Structure formats: C-alpha cells, structure tokens
Design a protein around this ligand. Sequence first.
Ligand SMILES: O=C(O)[C@@](O)(COP(=O)(O)O)[C@H](O)[C@H](O)COP(=O)(O)O
Ligand SMILES: O=C(O)[C@@](O)(COP(=O)(O)O)[C@H](O)[C@H](O)COP(=O)(O)O
Ligand SMILES: [Mg+2]
Ligand SMILES: [Mg+2]
Lengths: 123, 123, 463, 463
Amino acid sequence: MKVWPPIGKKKFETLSYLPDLTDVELAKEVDYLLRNKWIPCVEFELEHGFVYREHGNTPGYYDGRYWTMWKLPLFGCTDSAQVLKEVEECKKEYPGAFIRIIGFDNTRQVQCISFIAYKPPSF
Amino acid sequence: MKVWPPIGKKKFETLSYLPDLTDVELAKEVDYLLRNKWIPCVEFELEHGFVYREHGNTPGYYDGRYWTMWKLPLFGCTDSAQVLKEVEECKKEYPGAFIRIIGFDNTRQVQCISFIAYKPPSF
Amino acid sequence: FKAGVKEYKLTYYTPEYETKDTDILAAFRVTPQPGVPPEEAGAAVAAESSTGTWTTVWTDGLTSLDRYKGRCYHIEPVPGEETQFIAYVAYPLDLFEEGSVTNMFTSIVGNVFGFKALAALRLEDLRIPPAYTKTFQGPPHGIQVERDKLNKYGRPLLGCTIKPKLGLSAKNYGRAVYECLRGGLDFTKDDENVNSQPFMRWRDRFLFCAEAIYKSQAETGEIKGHYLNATAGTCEEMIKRAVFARELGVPIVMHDYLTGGFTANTSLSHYCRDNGLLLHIHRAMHAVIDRQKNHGMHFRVLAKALRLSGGDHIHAGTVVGKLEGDRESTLGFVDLLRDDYVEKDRSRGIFFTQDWVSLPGVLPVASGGIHVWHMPALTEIFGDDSVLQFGGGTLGHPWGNAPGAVANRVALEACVQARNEGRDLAVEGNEIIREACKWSPELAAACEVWKEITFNFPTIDKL
Amino acid sequence: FKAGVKEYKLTYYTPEYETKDTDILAAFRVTPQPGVPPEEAGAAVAAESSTGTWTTVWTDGLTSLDRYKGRCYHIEPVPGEETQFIAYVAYPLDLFEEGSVTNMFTSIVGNVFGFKALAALRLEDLRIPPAYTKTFQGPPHGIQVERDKLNKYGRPLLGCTIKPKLGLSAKNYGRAVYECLRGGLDFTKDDENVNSQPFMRWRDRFLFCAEAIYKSQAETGEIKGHYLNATAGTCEEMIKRAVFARELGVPIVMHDYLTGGFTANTSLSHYCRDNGLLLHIHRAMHAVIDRQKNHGMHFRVLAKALRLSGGDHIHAGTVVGKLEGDRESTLGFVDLLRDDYVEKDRSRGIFFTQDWVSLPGVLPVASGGIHVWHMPALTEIFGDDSVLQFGGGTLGHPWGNAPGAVANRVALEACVQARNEGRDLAVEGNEIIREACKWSPELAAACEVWKEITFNFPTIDKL
Ligand SMILES: O=C(O)[C@@](O)(COP(=O)(O)O)[C@H](O)[C@H](O)COP(=O)(O)O
Ligand SMILES: O=C(O)[C@@](O)(COP(=O)(O)O)[C@H](O)[C@H](O)COP(=O)(O)O
Ligand SMILES: [Mg+2]
Ligand SMILES: [Mg+2]
C-alpha cells in the first residue's frame, strides 16, 4: 500500500488528477470546446488560488469562486491558437497568477468545460 | 319516490330503524349478550334523551353520552328474566325515563351491545 | 482485510441461526434468476437490506457484523414452483430507527427488489417485535376509544363516499352529506382524490360539511361524522387542513397514507392524538404494490405498517365487491389489524405470530361496489368491529341519498337482529333482506335495482 | 336519472376525443380478465380514476361530466400479446390539486389497480401539461445552479456510499468520509437506511461529517459535500435534521422520497429552496413498484413525479451494475430528467412528448455495483451531467478510502480527456483505462481487484 499525501496535493477541478497537460493537450481541450460551439474565456487569479470562506458561511456560499476575467469571451472564435495566445498574453503580464480556460453554452447558460492552463512559480 | 321525514324520526342507535322489539325479542337480545359471556347493565335517563353540546365543543366531546346507572352490572347473572325485571323496576320507579340495556366485554373493556328497552310517554 | 468480491452466502446465509425475541423477521417470496442458487439469492437479500454491499469493505472490521448483519436463516420451497422459494431473514433491533416505518421499509424493501440476480421478489410478512412496537404511538385512538367517543355499540358502522368522485361544488357536497347522514349513515367521506381543486376548494368544503354534520345530527339524534380529507401536497398544507377540522369541532378526518406517505402520515397521526381527532386511513395506491403474487408487498405488510404509523380506520376490502380481496387472506389481516395477538396461521397467510403489546386496534373498512344484498355476507365476514361503506350504493338509490341511507341502515340492523337471534347470515342472507322489505319500502327499492349485481372474477392473489 | 348499473364504456370510452393542451395524459398497460372487452376495461380505468363509480348516481346532474370526466380516448393492442393493450386516458386540468404529486397519483393510480375485472395494470407514462407543471416548484436548484454553487464543470461528479450500510459509529462515519473526500471524490453519502439508530444517532453523525467535509475541502482545495440524510419517521424530525445541516453551513442533504413519501418530500424540497441546500434524492422502494413489465408503474413515471415534487439529484441506475436498468429505457428517462423538451420516442419508452417549461433539470445518479472498469461505459451513457457513485468501489480498494477515491477520480478524468481528444469510449474504453494504470498506481491496484467482475442477467423490464 501507498499512502495518499495529505500535503502538497492541492487540486484544480477537472483534469487536475492527471499529469500536467501539454500545450498540444491544452490546445486539444480548446478544440473540443470549440467543436461543441462553446464560447471560450480566460480567467486569472493572483491572491486566492483556492476556495475559502471569509465573508459568509451559509449553505452553498463560498469565497474565491469568482476569478477575474481576462478581457472578454471570444464570441465567434474559431482558433484554439487565439485562445492560447490570450493565455500567453495573460501569463506575461501576470506571471504570479493562476490562469484557467472555461467554456460557455449560451443556450443552457452553463459553463460546460473548465481547466487550468498555468500555475505560478509561487505554487 | 317517498320522502324520508325530516322530523318525528329521532333515533336510538342500534336496532332503532327496525320495528319496536317485543318483550320476547328484547329478551332474545339479552340471551345473545349472555351467550357471548358479556355482562349486562341497565341505564336510564330523565332529562337528555339525546346527545347535545352545552359544556364543550371540541372534537370527540359531546354531552348526554352518559346515562344514569340502574343499580350495578349483573355480574354472574345469566338469566334474561333478571335483566328484564330490572327494566321493569326502573320503568315503574321512573315512568318518564328512557331505558336501555348494555353489555360489556371485560377482557376488551368494550361495550359490545346496547339497545333501547323502554321509551317514556312524553316521547 | 482481503479486497475483492465474494459470495454473500459466506456471511449472510446462516441456516443455523435462532431468531431473537428482539429481531424483526421477514418472509420473502424470492424468484432467483436461472443459475442463481437459493442460498445465494437469500443471502443477497439479507445482505443488501442490512449491512452488505457487492465487494468486501475494510470498514467491516471497525464494528461487528456479528451483532448487526441481517441473516437469511431459513429457505423453504414453494409448492407449485420450481425455482421460487420463501427466504426468512432476521434483522437485529439496532438496525431500525425507533418509531419510523419509513426507516423500516427503507432497509427491508429499499434496494433488493431491483437486483439483477433476482427475477422477482415479494415481501409476504413481517414479525414486529414488542421492543420495536413500543417505539410507536400507533392509532390515535383505536376501536375501543372510537366506539366510546361516538357512543356507538353493537353493529358495524355505516359510511358512504360522496359521488361523483370529482366535480361537485362545496355547497353540493354538503347537500349530499346532509341527505346521506340524516338517513341513518354514521359517516360520509370525501373521495380519496377530493383534496382541494378548482371545482371545490377544501376550506369551503369543510365549512359546508360541518353545517351538514350538525344539521343531520340534530335531526337524527345520533352522532355523525364526515371524513374531511387532510391529504395534501405538503406537510404544512396537510396540518392546516386538520387544524381547521379541529376548529370546527368535528370528530373525524382522513388521510391517504400511501400517496401522502409514511413520514406525513405519522405526523398527522400524532396531531390527531394530540387533538382528539379520529383518523380514517385510505389505502390509495396499495394495489400498485400488492396485487401480484410474484412481486411486490402483500397488503398484510402494508396493514401492519399503517397500524404502527397510526390510523383509527383502514380500508380492508370487501371480498364480494368491485375490488379484489381473497376471503381467507382478508380474515387473516383483519385479525392482524384488530387483535392484540395473532398466532401463525399459514392457511390465512399469517407467516409469523404477531404480538401487538396493547397497541390499539384498527377498524377495518369494507368499501367498493357493495350494496344491500351484500349486507349479510359483509356482516358475516367482518363482524361488529368494521365500517361498511356504500357510495354508489347510497347515491345510486332511485329515491335519493336519505332513502338510500335508510335502505342500508335497515339492511344492516336486520342482519344484526337475525344473527343475534340465531340465524346463520352465511346461508339465510337473502331471506333476511327479503323479509325486511315488507315494512321498509326504502330497502325494497334498493333490492329491485341491484338484485342481479355481483362481482365474480378470477382471484389474482390466492393463498 | 335512471338508477342501476351501466357499462362504463357508455360514458368513459370516447375514442373520438381530441386531447387538449391542458390535459394530463396517461398510458396504461392493461391486461383485462378473460371475457372483458378492452373498450370496457379501458373505460373502467378512466371512470374510477376520475369521476365514476360502479352504479349510476343522481348527483351527476348537479355538475358536468362532460367537463370533468376522464376519457379513454384510444386503445392500442400490444404485439405478440393476445388481450393486453395500451389504454390512453385524458384527465382535465381541473381534476388535480395544484402543486400536489400526492393528489395526481391518488387519482391516476389510487384504486384502479385492484379492480376484479383486470388481471394486471401498469402505468407506463404521463403527459404533464405546462398548465400543471407551472404549479410546482420542482428541483430546489437544478443542474445549472448546482454546478455554479459547487464550482464544478466539465466532467461527471463522483460520489460514494459509506459502508457497511449500518453498524458504523458517528466518529467512524466521519473518518471514512474524510478519507474518501480527500482522495478526489466530490461527495460521499449516508446510506439510504442510515437515519438515526442505536449504533449512531443522527446529530452526532452530522457533526463529525461536517468536520470531515471541511478538513477534506481545506486539504484538496475543492468544494466537498456529504449527503446528510433527512429521512425520518415524522415531518418534524425530517425538518429538524435539515435545520441542523443548514446550521452547519454544509452544501447538500438527501431524502428517501418514496419511503418518506411525496407529502414530506415536497415540504423538504421547499425548505431546501428556502435555505440554499442541495437535495439528493434516493429512490429506495422504487423497484417494489417498477420492476415487472405487466403491473406497477414504470420508473419514468416515478422520475417525472420527483422532478415535479423536487430534487436536485435522483438515482437513475447504472445499466452495467448490480441493479437492473435497461439501456434504452434509461436513456429515455434520463432525458426526461435533464432536458427542457423531450420528443415522443417509443424506441426509448417515451409515450408522450414532454415539455418541461423551464422547470430545473435533475442530475441523474448512477450508483450500485460499479467500479473503475465501468468508467468508460458510464461516461459514455450519461455524459458530463451525472453523478457516478462508488461505495464498495472505494471502500473496497486494497489501500483504503483515499487511494480508492484517487483510482475513481483518475479513471474518470482519463475517460474525459480521451473523449475530448476524439477517442471512442465505447470501443477504446479498456485501453484508455490500461494507459492510466501506467502512471497511477492507485488506479492499477483498483483494476487488478475488479478485473473480472461484471453483472449480466436477463433483463426483466424491456421495451
Ligand atoms: O373510490 C371508490 O371507489 C370508493 O369511494 C368506493 O366507492 P363506491 O362505494 O361507490 O364503490 C372507495 O374509496 C374504494 O372502495 C376504495 O377501495 P378499497 O376500499 O378497496 O381500498
Ligand atoms: O445501498 C446501495 O447499494 C448503494 O449505496 C450502492 O452501494 P455500492 O456503491 O457499494 O454498490 C446505493 O444506494 C444503490 O446504488 C441504490 O440503488 P439505485 O441507484 O439503483 O437506486
Ligand atoms: Mg373513493
Ligand atoms: Mg445505499
């Protein structure tokens, strides 16, 4: 038996139990998002990488769920490279930020995909 | 079609929708009581021949349910004529009274039979 | 701890077990799939209704399966079936939440009926131990208290479902109730599906039915009731309805315990005990569960469950009316509803001896497709501690509700006096009814209408 | 008015009727007794589930049967079946109490299943019109809200029933919950029959489970839940338990909607809407009702009734696991649970087109006898909007709960990426799993234990 570490294993929701994705693997996730007609959007965070409770504690209330939006959603986008270009541009201005890619279905109005694309060196 | 009278048809629970019992039929019901090992008792009433609500009106509360006990239940008596003698004693002492015969099952503590035996001239 | 799948019978088939006096016992009619031996089928039913799942879990070692596991302790074949068998399962007392029929069913019938390895499954009976029975209030009042509150002794009670089932207004409902009650019925009732609806809202109906109860009681001199339906979409709506019945001072409400459900029904039963209201239970939905012989739950299981959760009446079938009711099976569960102690009697489907430790008894209610000509058989089947209900048999009389009620009341009292004087209701019933028509033109008119009406069909659920 | 019995078909068989867009529609699988015509059997079902009884009542003339009666409007013989047919019944909107599943079932399935003249009866589907749907709250939150509250996107959620079913102490329950959640599961849960019992009282369990939720959430950085069971014997106890879960600030509770009942479930659904609690619904007892093809109610009817009464999850079967669930029927009622509009499609058991008029969607939960090798098939059947639950499949891992949770999480995410990069889960599933064993030891240990475990038996309820 091997024991699952109780430290140093902080997670990032979907895909974060797999080894870190490669840039082609990140591009292929964007490809899947676009093939499903979802709207891609980049979000980034510099201070609270994980959910916390500071301002409330009632059922279903947490802090740290909202990140900051990077520009706007790429409506009518057709290139996963354009999404990765904004991740690189965000990486360059905020190298200490976590950065994630999300995807919206505007008919159901639900984010149908979400995965981290960059983690800062402080992590 | 015949219309059921809405007046002049006051009733007295079990058997009161049949023709009045003869003295042989009254005794026949007393025989049934005794055959079942029930213990008979006579009750009579001079003022409230029917249930009413004077002292309360909550669910399951009514006045006029208790009548007055004639003597005591005839424990160990197994002759119908003894019971009917008690009706006769009651009826001569209280000719203006309603008089009924009841029978208890003491294992279940349920009155298993009850029927009118005399109704006063005022009725 | 050894990880992996093993057979349930290695842990849950214990044919050597002796049931404890605190165990809840269950008798299951099991039809396993081809290739599945009865020992394994029975052990899977015991395992997955108590402590077990499909693979070995290490957490078993933190407690004691010995004290907690359900156990299939006996397996007996079914005469006339090649694969089907009865499996007897014993459940420790600690498995169950006190006072909760909901929890008891959740274990015993929660998941096992859907196992792929079983082709069919039916719970036939349960043995409820005294140590579990004493955790339940049971009926708010019960047979003895009900007769005493209403001052009614010596004969079955008489009731009647207002018809048409749906579509009547509140004022027309109270009109029908008054005319029925004043003719000699002790009760009338909302149909099971009369709750609150566009054609008639509940509060309006309650108000007019109260006017009818008290008018008919003042007229006749006999205590009257009308089962006011508390069944509702939410517990809050259900309780609101009962509170208004309480305000009105009336004696009896009703609940559809299966469609409302056991959690709600137990709440209402407690309310009725707290406020002195009789509680008539309608078994709507039961035949979805209890009709077929090979799968489901027998009504005697649902009847015991109602006695535990609580109700003063429960419908028990007619045998001879429009809904199915096997005679010997019905006599069995009528005893289980009324009596303090019922010995095992497989000839009447009673799989286990059942001690009720003075839990109050429930009045069985015979209702559905019955009329005056049925009175001798009903009186003979059920005896004095029952309610006989004539909806169509009252509102279908050619002279109206009051003469229909008189016909039914005369027909019943004729049977009582005949039986009390020695006549056999089971053989002289038509004579008894016929002879009573002489001085009762009302009964005569009902006899003419329904003389050739009988309900004889193949019995689906035979003993 | 003419007293006496008529055939039901004279009033209630109306094959020319045109259904209205406000009607509730029902498809019944009817098996009449020998000698009973389908038109009369179908009229009897329509009559005794709406306005009629066994004999003509004069009160019909006070109202309008034309506007209130249910109508058997169509008869559809069943192929390969001599006497069995589908009967189609339309019920006017006014028959039903707004917001009350209890009332809807009381009419449609109340008495008709016990009729002597029928040998068997099953309700297969119902068409709920938008005019009645809008009287229901439905789920307290629904799929979109739940994912938003939990911050979980792009994959199925993962759950796990703590085991053994019964017998664990409160402290030991919380220990298992912590070790499960910290390994990558989103949820754990009380077993359906874990309520409050001598071996573990509910309030102690809720307290220690809260400690485990917050410890594992702090450790992993992901929002965690444990379904705390509010099922109880009375509505008062049920609400008490939900109030304490609200005090603790936890995200999700659960309820056994069938053993608790619809009246209690609707009350709990409203409470959860009022207080922001997700409500996982366990379908304990459903197979008593839904297993056999000839009698009962199909699960799709029970699933629609839950979506009306209210729940954020409901168990919907696995297809591949230990409990029965036909694949095509399951695909049909999963759509009925999740989607806003579902077109009629008998190939998936959908008898009526169902419009949900924006009522929230319910997350289907696949649970029971599933393990790591089933992950590709489960992901393929249900897609991202599901909960896949592994009780024995986690607490059965040879290294314990955290490695067991890691195995399930890794397998799931490996299926997701493989799918998202264009692979065929239905054909490459086993190779996808073997590739992940290459870098996940936790998954490798799980695959070795369960490699040869499948559940394949003849399906009882087929289309
Ligand atoms: O809806 C009905 O049909 C009834 O009102 C009877 O009406 P009628 O008196 O007009 O027949 C009763 O609720 C049924 O007897 C219930 O069935 P059961 O007692 O078997 O549960
Ligand atoms: O009691 C059980 O068996 C479970 O906890 C599963 O345990 P495992 O995960 O250990 O198998 C679930 O409640 C069943 O899946 C319910 O069945 P369904 O989902 O069909 O309603
Ligand atoms: Mg009815
Ligand atoms: Mg479970």
